[PDB]
Amino acid sequence: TCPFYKKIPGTGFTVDAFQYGVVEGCTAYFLTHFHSDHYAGLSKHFTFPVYCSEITGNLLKNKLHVQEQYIHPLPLDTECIVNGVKVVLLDANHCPGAVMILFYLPNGTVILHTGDFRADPSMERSLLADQKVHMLYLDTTYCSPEYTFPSQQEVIRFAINTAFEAVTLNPHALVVCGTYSIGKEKVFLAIADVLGSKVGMSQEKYKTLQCLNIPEINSLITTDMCSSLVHLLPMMQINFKGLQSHLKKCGGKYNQILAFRPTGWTHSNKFTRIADVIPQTKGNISIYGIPYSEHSSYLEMKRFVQWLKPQKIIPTVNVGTWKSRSTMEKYFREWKLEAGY
Ligand code: NI
């Protein structure tokens, strides 16, 4: 049964709640983004109205075959009316098509649901600035002060410089990047751009990227692996065995692999700077784990909440253990005492 933190009080609405069958009293199902823990349950047989971004709606139609008549895409940064309630979709700085949802309840309460997000000071100048928010349904993935990571820009600088150096030293090196969901496209696109190559990938992944409205994409990606020196593989294949096997398939075109796994956080973050990151190596294969996050760090999250000053916070992540829940509630109280709301 649907958990309380997926239900929007005073409405007929749910958020990211497609795996519970027909939810009692739900008149409209919102979907924040196309990640499987959030869309789990949708298919061509779904016949209730789904509200989402344009990009999410492209993916529902093309990847999951949801019929068009049930997809209701909304423009961003625009006041819209859904079943008699004003809503706004805002960019969540997560993966392509990911949104936060502002709900303006008929009684005057204003609710922000962040979906999954990476907080940023740029959000302090969207339509959020214009009214008070009473209740915050918060992505608390990294809600603990151990979670520090660099900016996305520092991480991409590291990856570009590393790949450019390796391939200039050895023009027969292949670069491989792992993926298993949408998101983090900058990693492989920025490396292909510095090398003057397209990114090669499976037909299924090319299909997915073609749903994303990324400008000039026909210019950056391809299904012709033979013409590409940056390849995308499933995340599960980014290990020494999987990469040795791939290099065999390339027919002697290449004699070295440099591979990247964009993780979120890993405990090498508490001791080491990005500058100082080193790969795991075996023979002619090297693997870099790079801390490219699409969720808020602890300090990014804290700054957003201290700016927004909500009256009540409802966590949406790490809610399954009493120790997690108690930890998070203690931080929320600190933040409120330090800022004075
Ligand atoms: Ni997500």
From Swiss-Prot:
Tissue specificity is: Expressed in brain, heart, kidney, liver, pancreas, placenta and skeletal muscle.
**Description of what induces expression:** During mitosis. The mRNA encoding this protein contains an internal ribosome entry site (IRES) in its 5'-UTR. This 5'-UTR generally suppresses translation while specifically promoting expression during mitosis, when cap-dependent translation may be impaired.
Q: Where in the cell is it found?
A: Nucleus
Query: Which chain positions lie within coiled-coil regions?
Result: none
The effect of D139N is: Impaired nuclear focus formation, reduced interaction with PIAS and increased sensitivity to cisplatin
What is this protein's function?
May be required for DNA interstrand cross-link repair. Also required for checkpoint mediated cell cycle arrest in early prophase in response to mitotic spindle poisons. Possesses beta-lactamase activity, catalyzing the hydrolysis of penicillin G and nitrocefin. Exhibits no activity towards other beta-lactam antibiotic classes including cephalosporins (cefotaxime) and carbapenems (imipenem).
Q: Which family does it belong to?
A: Belongs to the DNA repair metallo-beta-lactamase (DRMBL) family.
Subunit comment: Binds constitutively to TP53BP1. Binds CDC27, which is itself a component of the anaphase promoting complex (APC). Binds PIAS1.
Name listed for the protein in its UniProt record: DNA cross-link repair 1A protein
- Name its species: Homo sapiens
Tell me what gene encodes this. Answer: DCLRE1A
Included range, full protein: 700 to 1040 of 1040
